[PDB]
Amino acid sequence: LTKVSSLGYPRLGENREWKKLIEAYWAGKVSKNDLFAGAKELRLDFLKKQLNAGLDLIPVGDFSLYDHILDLSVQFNIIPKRFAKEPIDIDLYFAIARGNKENVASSMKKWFNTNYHYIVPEWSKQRPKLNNNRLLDLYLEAREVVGDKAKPVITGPITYVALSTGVEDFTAAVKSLLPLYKQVFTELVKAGASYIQVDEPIFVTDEGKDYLQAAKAVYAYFAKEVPDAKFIFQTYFEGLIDSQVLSQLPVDAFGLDFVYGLEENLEAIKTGAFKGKEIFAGVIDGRNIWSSDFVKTSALLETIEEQSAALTIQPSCSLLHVPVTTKNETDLDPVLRNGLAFADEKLTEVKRLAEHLDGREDPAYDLHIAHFDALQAADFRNVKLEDLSRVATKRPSDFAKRRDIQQEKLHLPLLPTTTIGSFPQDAEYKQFIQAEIERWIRIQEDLDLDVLVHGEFERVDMVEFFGQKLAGFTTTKFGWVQSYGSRAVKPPIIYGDVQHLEPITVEETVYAQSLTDRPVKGMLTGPITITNWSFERTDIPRDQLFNQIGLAIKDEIKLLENAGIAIIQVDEAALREGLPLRKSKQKAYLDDAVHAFHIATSSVKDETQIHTHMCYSKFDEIIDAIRALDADVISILGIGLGVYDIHSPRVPTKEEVVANIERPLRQLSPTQFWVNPDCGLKTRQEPETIAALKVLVAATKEVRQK
């Protein structure tokens, strides 16, 4: 009798029908009737998949035409001031999300530590009120398909306000929303709702410690106002903060993440603090694509059941964070595919975990373990890699000594100018790329940049480009995951031991270098970004994976250096998403990244300059780690200076760029700086780009003069 559930489901559809539908609507090629009709068709198909998988409580409410937080902003009347005069309908919804002819769109931010982005609410002087019956309509629609199995879901008020901007008083804002949620819940109960999922993930974060009292007040309010609702205080992405305190909230059930919050939540459980509450145990990884370790998971569930009043099994977080199904992934090896589980396969896993716990006899249980075991015994997870005790983890000469040697060989001027790597964008294709590479080499020479790059025109993704040629990686045909709005990504999968077996970037880099006398940089991607953007294995620890990747990078760097490349750069763009949520776990992560960086870059000659670019904001908390890297230069102790916002079609002026470059020279010796644009340039336009790079050179040459 162990119930099975889920927090949410992807919106894309098996073939990204959702993406095509809303984009077509925006392009004026799909009418409102067909937009809503096509969306309804998708919703009914999703409900049926969850019904057929055996779920007892099927989530309803997370489907959206863009973002679930934006849904609440329109529903609760938290509409940006500039949009206040627009009729409240689907066109306003999209205007806020994408902007229109007269107003810019609302900004987006990462959803906790995932690769999903939500639309940030902009509070002003507007008074909250319900502008529609969004959730009630979805619930009643769901009931027709699944009956009493329908479980309304919604993001809670505390989390909603915490993820907003423009709020001067937190408690006031939360309070103003309570009556709206009250009505929403009351109407759902009247329509037949029992269990209601209220997402409050802010309570797995460090920031959450400031809202413990708000939770007590808010949920005590809901409990008294809506007595018949069985609220599930839903959390995910880490352990429940202050479990002893929050365990006494007046709710019938708590959703705890046992995949990303195992140690912490298991401790809370063992204290008996939840002996009188129902636990919705997230035991299936809702953010990765590996079939579950049933023996491990079932043992955990027995422990959870013995320490709770009741238990419901579900994934760790909404399935919104993984692709739809392995069903049509025909190019994959059978041993691998049988060990994979996307959204639809995870619905099946939860059902089977509950059947096993209840003593039901199901052949699929042990068969699942058999396939899992086959994957673990696979030859591709038992590859003999290079012996790390024979790989340098520290360069033979310190920075000071390397600085001079490199200066004598490169003879670079004061405040050298360069770019980050990308520009705007069988034999036929290669010569097409080379022609473009040369065209931009001349463009760079004509602008007089000191250190050049080939453009990365042959690359569409800084991670897929490497995964394509590395052993241990594979790509899927349809494994798409929504990133933001109608944009989706198809992450590569690191399924086995990573190994470098062939040159990846040598050809184009050497080609570019053969066309100029100026030094040309090599361009590689680091382990932080490769692991974060990819669906990494979960059968080996993080440090082992980072190190394998470090070894592969080292191998590529050896090929570049042998080919005569004097400068090699290691790119890291995902530190913001990779750094653990919890402050207390960040040092261990950084330590692993630093070690892998040493493995990758400690085997070069002293004359070879090692650069690293890290898209980040505040290095104050991670300064000792940056130093530990011992990189000759790091674009943002040699340090590169970004002074051109590449994320905007705006062309800077000499007067502005000159200020940007001079500010940092106020302290440290000017003999450690370089000048270049911020993270990337691939999303820019040629005219704007070239004109902007021209002002950069002129501005720098002027500062040298000074």
XYZ file of C-alpha atoms in Angstrom:
706
model
C 0.000 0.000 0.000
C 3.031 2.266 -0.390
C 1.902 5.143 -2.605
C 3.949 6.212 -5.616
C 4.173 9.774 -6.881
C 6.215 12.382 -8.717
C 6.839 16.144 -8.324
C 6.573 17.212 -11.950
C 7.164 16.204 -15.569
C 8.879 17.673 -18.686
C 6.778 19.973 -20.898
C 8.659 19.319 -24.149
C 6.849 16.235 -25.403
C 8.667 13.233 -26.896
C 9.681 15.222 -29.983
C 9.763 18.742 -28.536
C 6.229 19.368 -29.784
C 5.873 21.905 -26.978
C 8.854 23.908 -28.249
C 7.577 23.933 -31.827
C 4.098 24.937 -30.641
C 5.004 28.027 -28.598
C 7.676 29.169 -31.032
C 5.155 28.859 -33.869
C 2.710 30.901 -31.808
C 5.290 33.642 -31.302
C 6.044 33.628 -35.029
C 2.356 34.111 -35.802
C 1.992 30.659 -37.389
C -0.234 29.030 -34.737
C -3.502 30.524 -33.436
C -4.533 30.850 -29.789
C -7.062 28.038 -30.265
C -4.363 25.723 -31.565
C -1.816 26.834 -28.959
C -4.179 25.916 -26.117
C -5.452 22.830 -27.944
C -1.933 21.573 -28.618
C -0.920 22.289 -25.040
C -3.982 20.427 -23.734
C -3.136 17.484 -25.973
C 0.343 17.363 -24.447
C -0.973 17.630 -20.887
C -3.394 14.748 -21.423
C -0.603 12.591 -22.884
C 1.601 13.310 -19.849
C -1.185 12.496 -17.418
C -1.790 9.185 -19.210
C 1.883 8.251 -19.050
C 1.901 8.820 -15.295
C -1.414 7.016 -14.876
C -0.209 4.000 -16.874
C 3.023 3.839 -14.859
C 0.929 3.163 -11.764
C 1.278 6.446 -9.877
C -1.154 6.921 -6.986
C -0.602 10.671 -6.819
C 0.031 12.283 -10.191
C 1.389 15.853 -10.173
C -0.788 18.475 -11.815
C 0.060 22.139 -12.143
C 3.710 22.235 -13.168
C 2.975 22.128 -16.893
C 3.566 25.618 -18.240
C 3.800 27.543 -21.491
C 7.155 29.040 -20.439
C 8.012 28.945 -16.700
C 6.210 27.919 -13.484
C 7.336 30.994 -11.537
C 6.098 33.350 -14.256
C 2.790 31.447 -14.000
C 2.470 32.563 -10.382
C 3.479 36.145 -11.137
C 0.609 36.541 -13.612
C -1.771 34.468 -11.473
C -1.030 36.522 -8.333
C -0.879 39.896 -10.159
C 2.836 40.477 -9.537
C 3.193 42.058 -12.968
C 6.098 44.405 -13.763
C 5.073 48.073 -13.564
C 5.915 48.775 -17.214
C 3.329 46.130 -18.209
C 0.564 47.342 -15.865
C -1.650 48.725 -18.656
C -1.797 45.503 -20.686
C -4.882 43.261 -20.721
C -4.060 40.203 -18.618
C -4.014 37.261 -21.017
C -1.610 34.893 -22.804
C -0.059 37.728 -24.788
C 0.912 39.598 -21.605
C 2.303 36.332 -20.239
C 4.636 35.993 -23.218
C 5.421 39.730 -23.250
C 6.765 39.487 -19.701
C 8.783 36.397 -20.631
C 10.123 37.657 -23.962
C 9.416 41.381 -23.961
C 7.636 43.313 -26.703
C 7.927 46.362 -28.947
C 7.953 48.832 -26.051
C 9.126 46.918 -22.966
C 12.061 44.630 -22.164
C 11.362 41.173 -20.767
C 11.717 40.200 -17.124
C 15.146 38.791 -16.303
C 15.827 35.108 -15.665
C 17.969 33.399 -13.022
C 19.185 29.859 -12.442
C 16.739 27.636 -10.569
C 18.840 26.740 -7.544
C 21.786 24.663 -8.791
C 20.105 23.137 -11.855
C 20.458 24.089 -15.506
C 16.871 25.386 -15.595
C 16.157 29.134 -15.407
C 13.028 30.786 -14.002
C 11.578 34.242 -14.721
C 12.269 36.650 -11.859
C 9.185 38.334 -10.289
C 9.417 42.137 -10.153
C 7.574 43.478 -7.125
C 6.503 47.113 -7.131
C 3.449 48.800 -5.620
C 0.932 46.446 -7.229
C -1.459 44.684 -4.878
C -1.665 40.892 -5.239
C -4.953 39.372 -6.366
C -5.937 36.294 -8.358
C -6.122 37.091 -12.075
C -7.196 33.612 -13.167
C -8.025 30.062 -12.047
C -4.885 28.490 -13.516
C -4.364 25.616 -11.060
C -8.039 24.917 -10.471
C -8.574 24.576 -14.243
C -5.598 22.253 -14.629
C -6.745 20.193 -11.636
C -10.298 19.719 -12.902
C -8.892 18.833 -16.307
C -6.577 16.267 -14.715
C -9.400 14.718 -12.676
C -11.211 13.742 -15.857
C -8.187 11.664 -16.806
C -6.902 10.391 -13.441
C -9.684 10.952 -10.907
C -8.655 11.212 -7.238
C -5.056 10.418 -8.227
C -4.635 14.070 -9.252
C -2.225 15.923 -6.950
C -2.122 19.724 -7.327
C 1.413 21.167 -7.164
C 2.504 24.783 -6.647
C 5.574 26.746 -5.561
C 5.139 27.980 -1.991
C 5.019 31.666 -0.955
C 8.288 31.797 0.989
C 10.301 30.390 -1.901
C 8.377 32.543 -4.391
C 9.226 35.777 -2.556
C 12.817 34.642 -1.889
C 13.355 34.189 -5.634
C 11.887 37.614 -6.436
C 13.465 41.039 -6.847
C 12.128 44.422 -5.732
C 10.989 43.216 -2.286
C 11.989 45.623 0.501
C 10.128 43.678 3.208
C 10.128 39.891 2.964
C 7.497 39.071 5.571
C 5.076 41.699 4.247
C 5.230 40.267 0.730
C 4.738 36.670 1.882
C 1.771 37.721 4.017
C 0.119 39.579 1.141
C 0.084 36.327 -0.823
C -1.371 34.054 1.850
C -5.047 34.906 1.169
C -4.533 34.071 -2.507
C -2.977 30.662 -1.780
C -5.779 30.153 0.734
C -8.451 30.607 -1.907
C -6.469 28.514 -4.400
C -6.241 25.626 -1.924
C -9.826 25.987 -0.725
C -11.164 25.754 -4.293
C -8.968 22.713 -5.006
C -10.251 20.915 -1.906
C -13.843 21.777 -2.894
C -13.147 20.246 -6.318
C -11.965 17.073 -4.595
C -8.272 17.588 -3.803
C -6.693 15.777 -0.860
C -2.886 15.736 -1.083
C -1.431 19.065 -2.235
C 2.267 19.514 -3.017
C 3.679 22.867 -1.895
C 7.280 23.397 -3.075
C 9.504 25.234 -0.554
C 13.040 24.307 -1.771
C 14.396 27.487 -0.205
C 14.544 25.304 2.914
C 17.404 23.146 1.656
C 19.599 26.245 1.226
C 21.781 28.277 3.583
C 19.488 31.238 2.926
C 16.617 29.136 4.214
C 17.894 29.398 7.776
C 16.520 32.963 7.876
C 12.939 31.838 7.128
C 12.298 29.088 9.685
C 9.849 31.267 11.605
C 8.110 32.355 8.401
C 7.496 28.672 7.634
C 5.937 28.099 11.044
C 3.646 31.113 10.573
C 2.716 30.383 6.961
C 1.960 26.685 7.304
C 0.149 27.110 10.622
C -2.052 29.558 8.688
C -2.708 27.109 5.835
C -3.361 24.270 8.279
C -6.104 26.216 10.086
C -7.604 27.830 6.966
C -7.700 24.622 4.898
C -8.141 21.799 7.501
C -9.016 19.075 4.983
C -6.003 19.499 2.703
C -3.084 17.114 3.261
C -0.207 19.482 2.554
C 3.152 18.099 1.533
C 5.891 20.531 2.573
C 8.012 19.668 -0.486
C 11.784 20.221 -0.592
C 14.508 19.136 -3.022
C 18.157 19.593 -4.123
C 19.747 19.149 -0.674
C 18.924 18.108 2.873
C 16.267 19.830 4.941
C 17.886 22.622 6.933
C 17.089 22.627 10.656
C 15.131 19.368 10.383
C 14.380 19.238 14.119
C 12.671 22.629 13.928
C 10.843 22.182 10.621
C 9.661 18.672 11.537
C 7.058 20.269 13.805
C 5.321 22.253 11.060
C 1.576 21.520 11.166
C 1.584 19.679 7.823
C 0.610 16.067 7.153
C 3.637 15.261 5.033
C 7.198 16.303 4.232
C 8.937 15.752 0.917
C 12.593 14.941 1.631
C 15.399 14.525 -0.893
C 17.353 11.348 -0.121
C 19.501 11.524 -3.237
C 20.985 15.014 -2.799
C 20.258 15.277 0.928
C 20.920 11.687 2.017
C 23.181 12.034 5.070
C 21.310 15.005 6.526
C 17.772 13.753 5.948
C 18.680 10.209 7.018
C 19.977 11.665 10.297
C 16.757 13.625 10.782
C 14.804 10.411 10.173
C 16.858 8.341 12.625
C 16.121 10.793 15.450
C 12.460 9.862 15.156
C 11.440 13.468 14.497
C 9.198 12.298 11.639
C 7.749 9.203 13.312
C 4.374 10.962 13.334
C 4.455 12.364 9.806
C 4.122 10.920 6.319
C 7.369 11.102 4.360
C 7.434 11.583 0.596
C 10.882 10.127 0.030
C 12.666 11.330 -3.082
C 14.828 8.259 -3.679
C 15.114 8.221 -7.459
C 17.563 10.739 -8.953
C 15.401 13.368 -10.605
C 18.410 15.134 -12.129
C 20.410 12.342 -13.751
C 19.776 9.534 -16.209
C 21.031 6.295 -14.611
C 18.801 3.366 -13.703
C 18.475 3.082 -9.920
C 20.588 0.848 -7.648
C 17.532 -1.071 -6.372
C 19.363 -3.023 -3.666
C 20.725 0.236 -2.238
C 17.481 2.139 -2.680
C 15.200 -0.562 -1.278
C 17.393 -0.918 1.819
C 17.157 2.855 2.363
C 13.371 2.763 1.998
C 13.039 0.082 4.695
C 14.927 2.390 7.058
C 12.690 5.314 6.117
C 9.486 3.299 6.581
C 10.516 2.158 10.054
C 10.977 5.820 11.045
C 7.837 7.439 9.585
C 4.047 7.317 10.099
C 3.563 6.599 6.410
C 5.669 6.756 3.279
C 5.157 7.628 -0.373
C 7.901 6.968 -2.929
C 8.844 9.463 -5.647
C 11.859 10.919 -7.477
C 14.192 13.469 -5.831
C 12.914 16.442 -7.799
C 10.586 17.180 -10.718
C 11.297 15.090 -13.815
C 11.379 18.444 -15.571
C 15.143 18.107 -15.087
C 15.762 15.020 -17.252
C 14.830 13.979 -20.797
C 11.587 12.131 -21.572
C 12.515 8.561 -22.564
C 15.229 6.095 -23.610
C 12.572 4.434 -25.800
C 13.887 5.634 -29.172
C 17.606 5.816 -28.376
C 18.440 3.161 -30.954
C 22.117 4.025 -31.526
C 23.121 3.165 -27.955
C 24.794 -0.087 -26.917
C 22.188 -2.420 -25.332
C 24.164 -2.821 -22.106
C 24.190 0.962 -21.742
C 20.597 1.687 -22.719
C 19.391 -1.015 -20.313
C 21.193 0.852 -17.534
C 19.682 4.229 -18.396
C 16.448 5.698 -17.106
C 14.942 8.936 -18.364
C 11.663 10.455 -17.099
C 9.287 7.712 -18.248
C 11.563 4.941 -17.003
C 11.794 6.600 -13.556
C 8.002 6.547 -13.224
C 8.261 2.801 -13.698
C 11.098 2.568 -11.159
C 9.144 4.257 -8.385
C 6.180 1.935 -8.920
C 8.460 -1.107 -8.735
C 10.253 0.146 -5.640
C 6.887 0.409 -3.866
C 5.765 -3.029 -5.054
C 8.975 -4.567 -3.733
C 8.700 -2.811 -0.366
C 5.099 -4.026 -0.043
C 6.132 -7.613 -0.692
C 4.509 -7.815 -4.095
C 6.169 -10.333 -6.374
C 7.295 -8.722 -9.615
C 9.827 -10.269 -12.033
C 10.871 -6.795 -13.175
C 12.552 -6.112 -9.823
C 15.425 -8.574 -10.067
C 15.613 -8.125 -13.841
C 16.277 -4.443 -13.154
C 19.152 -5.414 -10.871
C 20.518 -7.773 -13.551
C 20.687 -4.997 -16.155
C 22.169 -2.626 -13.565
C 24.846 -5.227 -12.740
C 25.632 -5.736 -16.439
C 26.343 -2.026 -16.876
C 28.684 -1.995 -13.876
C 30.620 -4.991 -15.232
C 30.912 -3.399 -18.664
C 34.369 -3.172 -20.221
C 33.931 0.592 -20.673
C 33.786 1.093 -16.886
C 36.910 -1.003 -16.386
C 39.429 0.790 -18.612
C 43.089 0.882 -17.591
C 43.962 4.580 -17.501
C 47.302 6.275 -16.966
C 48.878 5.662 -13.536
C 48.452 8.989 -11.706
C 51.545 8.452 -9.557
C 53.509 8.958 -12.779
C 51.789 12.221 -13.695
C 53.082 15.577 -12.441
C 50.713 17.566 -10.243
C 52.993 20.572 -9.818
C 55.021 22.404 -12.467
C 58.854 22.253 -12.073
C 59.208 26.037 -11.888
C 57.140 28.563 -9.920
C 55.304 31.502 -11.516
C 58.147 33.983 -11.043
C 60.648 31.764 -12.860
C 58.168 30.849 -15.609
C 57.148 34.484 -16.067
C 60.608 35.506 -17.300
C 61.203 32.474 -19.522
C 57.845 33.078 -21.208
C 58.554 36.798 -21.609
C 61.799 36.047 -23.468
C 60.012 33.758 -25.914
C 56.770 35.678 -26.457
C 58.167 39.223 -26.167
C 54.648 40.549 -25.514
C 54.074 44.282 -24.823
C 52.605 45.950 -21.747
C 48.952 45.046 -21.257
C 48.718 42.533 -24.142
C 45.393 42.393 -25.987
C 43.552 39.185 -26.856
C 40.077 37.634 -26.985
C 38.460 34.726 -25.141
C 38.152 32.380 -28.110
C 34.897 32.469 -30.072
C 33.724 34.838 -32.802
C 30.295 35.316 -34.449
C 29.026 32.482 -36.658
C 34.173 16.473 -45.159
C 36.910 18.295 -47.071
C 34.396 20.858 -48.290
C 33.344 21.608 -44.710
C 36.906 21.782 -43.368
C 38.079 24.205 -46.054
C 34.943 26.240 -45.364
C 35.955 26.512 -41.714
C 39.589 27.222 -42.530
C 38.590 29.957 -44.966
C 36.612 31.567 -42.141
C 39.461 30.995 -39.691
C 41.859 32.861 -41.967
C 39.346 35.638 -42.610
C 39.194 36.281 -38.876
C 42.950 35.959 -38.440
C 43.351 38.872 -40.872
C 40.585 40.737 -39.079
C 42.477 40.246 -35.798
C 45.805 41.226 -37.341
C 44.189 44.316 -38.875
C 42.799 45.289 -35.459
C 46.261 44.587 -34.040
C 45.347 42.137 -31.305
C 48.552 40.798 -29.720
C 47.424 37.211 -29.062
C 45.022 35.552 -31.504
C 42.431 32.743 -31.541
C 40.958 30.741 -34.427
C 37.317 31.589 -33.752
C 35.980 28.195 -32.663
C 33.755 28.310 -35.750
C 33.763 24.519 -35.878
C 32.303 24.370 -32.356
C 28.627 24.730 -31.455
C 29.024 23.702 -27.818
C 32.156 24.003 -25.643
C 31.437 20.582 -24.118
C 29.851 18.510 -26.895
C 32.866 19.326 -29.074
C 35.139 17.480 -26.644
C 32.732 14.738 -25.649
C 32.414 13.843 -29.332
C 36.019 12.634 -29.406
C 36.512 11.275 -25.874
C 36.122 7.638 -24.880
C 33.507 7.282 -22.141
C 31.104 9.864 -23.635
C 28.063 9.362 -25.860
C 25.329 11.567 -27.293
C 21.620 10.858 -27.481
C 19.291 11.359 -30.432
C 16.382 12.898 -28.502
C 17.504 13.461 -24.885
C 16.389 17.074 -24.619
C 15.941 19.003 -21.365
C 14.328 22.450 -21.079
C 16.883 25.128 -20.131
C 14.780 28.299 -20.361
C 11.639 29.216 -22.249
C 11.521 27.233 -25.491
C 15.267 26.624 -25.432
C 16.369 23.079 -24.627
C 19.719 21.293 -24.401
C 20.658 17.706 -25.195
C 23.438 16.966 -22.652
C 26.080 14.418 -23.515
C 26.356 11.372 -21.237
C 29.608 10.347 -19.554
C 28.778 6.648 -19.319
C 32.244 5.155 -18.993
C 35.860 5.823 -18.082
C 37.082 8.938 -19.894
C 40.097 8.574 -22.154
C 41.771 10.710 -24.821
C 42.520 8.617 -27.905
C 42.833 11.243 -30.647
C 43.616 14.962 -31.172
C 40.551 17.113 -30.644
C 41.552 20.743 -31.276
C 45.039 20.450 -32.795
C 44.146 20.742 -36.487
C 42.330 24.096 -36.402
C 44.623 25.635 -33.770
C 47.798 24.757 -35.692
C 46.151 25.912 -38.936
C 45.348 29.282 -37.400
C 48.901 29.548 -36.057
C 50.374 28.737 -39.478
C 48.724 31.883 -40.881
C 50.276 34.408 -38.497
C 53.467 35.412 -36.693
C 51.486 36.355 -33.587
C 50.956 33.712 -30.864
C 47.731 31.711 -31.160
C 46.001 30.302 -28.064
C 44.836 26.730 -27.675
C 41.269 26.443 -26.399
C 40.143 23.672 -24.039
C 37.274 23.155 -21.593
C 37.859 22.228 -17.955
C 36.298 19.489 -15.755
C 33.910 21.806 -13.909
C 32.088 22.695 -17.126
C 32.371 19.256 -18.729
C 30.886 17.544 -15.687
C 28.199 20.166 -14.992
C 26.904 20.398 -18.579
C 26.998 16.626 -19.070
C 24.996 13.959 -17.256
C 27.904 12.515 -15.254
C 28.214 8.947 -13.970
C 27.085 8.508 -10.397
C 28.787 5.133 -9.835
C 32.201 6.690 -9.092
C 33.062 9.662 -6.849
C 33.458 13.229 -8.130
C 37.218 13.395 -7.657
C 37.806 10.200 -9.652
C 35.781 11.626 -12.553
C 37.443 15.062 -12.382
C 40.845 13.392 -12.443
C 40.050 11.202 -15.471
C 39.004 14.340 -17.335
C 42.117 16.110 -16.078
C 44.208 13.330 -17.600
C 42.416 13.623 -20.959
C 42.974 17.379 -21.014
C 46.648 16.822 -20.174
C 46.939 14.475 -23.165
C 45.423 17.098 -25.487
C 47.704 19.807 -24.106
C 50.726 17.606 -24.869
C 49.633 17.341 -28.513
C 49.135 21.105 -28.791
C 52.499 21.864 -27.184
C 54.247 19.310 -29.416
C 52.632 21.032 -32.401
C 54.149 24.345 -31.341
C 51.228 26.103 -29.637
C 52.773 28.527 -27.147
C 49.637 29.466 -25.233
C 46.868 27.142 -24.073
C 43.678 28.213 -22.292
C 41.438 26.120 -20.032
C 37.815 27.339 -20.035
C 35.393 27.089 -17.113
C 31.953 28.641 -17.508
C 29.894 26.584 -15.053
C 31.480 27.362 -11.682
C 28.241 29.165 -10.776
C 26.229 25.969 -11.295
C 28.900 23.507 -10.220
C 29.767 24.976 -6.820
C 27.705 23.061 -4.222
C 24.597 24.756 -2.843
C 25.845 24.465 0.740
C 28.696 26.755 1.793
C 30.062 23.973 4.021
C 30.624 21.704 1.008
C 32.201 24.213 -1.382
C 35.826 23.848 -0.235
C 35.859 20.104 -0.984
C 34.504 20.773 -4.479
C 37.095 23.478 -5.133
C 39.846 21.205 -3.824
C 38.803 18.550 -6.363
C 38.734 21.034 -9.239
C 42.154 22.410 -8.285
C 43.684 18.941 -8.175
C 42.225 18.035 -11.569
C 43.569 21.347 -12.937
C 47.041 20.408 -11.717
C 46.802 17.016 -13.411
C 45.834 18.670 -16.690
C 48.429 21.449 -16.715
C 51.501 20.319 -14.793
C 53.243 18.437 -17.605
C 54.035 21.357 -19.924
C 57.432 22.995 -20.406
C 58.078 26.141 -18.372
C 57.946 28.297 -21.522
C 54.396 27.160 -22.294
C 51.914 29.698 -20.943
C 48.798 28.304 -19.248
C 45.668 30.472 -19.288
C 42.319 29.807 -17.659
C 39.094 31.694 -18.200
C 36.435 31.474 -15.519
C 33.053 33.132 -16.008
C 32.264 34.252 -12.456
C 31.235 37.217 -10.305
C 32.809 37.203 -6.838
C 36.254 35.680 -6.314
C 36.383 36.913 -2.710
C 35.223 33.577 -1.257
C 37.333 31.568 -3.707
C 40.620 33.477 -3.905
C 42.918 30.877 -2.340
C 41.581 28.280 -4.770
C 42.304 30.502 -7.769
C 45.870 30.919 -6.493
C 46.224 27.175 -5.946
C 45.547 26.665 -9.669
C 48.898 28.353 -10.361
C 47.762 29.371 -13.857
C 50.046 31.860 -15.608
C 46.990 33.950 -16.488
C 43.288 33.990 -15.584
C 40.861 36.162 -17.530
C 37.900 37.637 -15.666
C 49.737 36.558 -10.571
C 48.826 37.133 -14.211
C 45.237 38.233 -14.794
C 43.250 39.062 -17.912
C 40.793 41.960 -17.839
C 37.360 41.782 -19.414
C 36.187 45.267 -20.390
C 33.611 44.650 -23.126
C 30.172 43.254 -22.274
C 29.714 40.666 -25.007
C 26.177 39.887 -23.832
C 24.886 43.104 -25.411
C 24.819 44.486 -28.992
C 26.187 47.709 -27.515
C 29.503 49.051 -28.788
C 31.562 50.673 -25.990
C 33.498 53.931 -26.271
C 37.217 54.499 -25.680
C 36.438 56.637 -22.639
C 34.462 53.844 -20.965
C 36.809 50.975 -21.800
C 39.803 53.071 -20.694
C 38.221 53.431 -17.250
C 37.540 49.698 -17.007
C 41.187 48.889 -17.713
C 42.670 51.598 -15.493
C 40.664 50.803 -12.349
C 42.440 47.464 -11.681
C 45.888 48.948 -12.405
C 45.323 51.046 -9.289
C 46.860 48.340 -7.087
C 48.931 45.454 -8.474
C 51.845 45.890 -10.883
C 50.569 46.593 -14.450
C 52.912 43.835 -15.667
C 50.352 41.174 -14.764
C 47.393 42.339 -16.826
C 45.950 41.683 -20.267
C 42.948 43.230 -21.983
C 40.102 41.331 -23.634
C 36.294 41.105 -23.810
C 34.280 39.230 -21.153
C 33.118 35.577 -21.475
C 32.968 34.690 -25.153
C 31.844 36.550 -28.260
C 30.100 33.812 -30.277
C 26.659 35.334 -29.639
C 27.677 38.742 -30.973
C 27.373 40.288 -34.443
C 30.424 40.827 -36.684
C 30.000 44.588 -37.320
C 29.376 45.373 -33.645
C 32.116 42.944 -32.627
C 34.827 44.310 -34.923
C 33.940 47.928 -34.149
C 33.986 47.074 -30.433
C 37.339 45.296 -30.625
C 38.741 48.348 -32.409
C 37.934 50.603 -29.454
C 39.472 47.999 -27.127
C 42.834 48.117 -28.919
C 42.850 51.923 -29.131
C 41.885 52.224 -25.471
C 44.667 49.879 -24.381
C 47.334 51.441 -26.588
C 46.340 54.719 -24.941
C 46.761 53.360 -21.400
C 50.195 52.000 -22.326
C 51.076 55.533 -23.423
C 49.927 56.878 -20.042
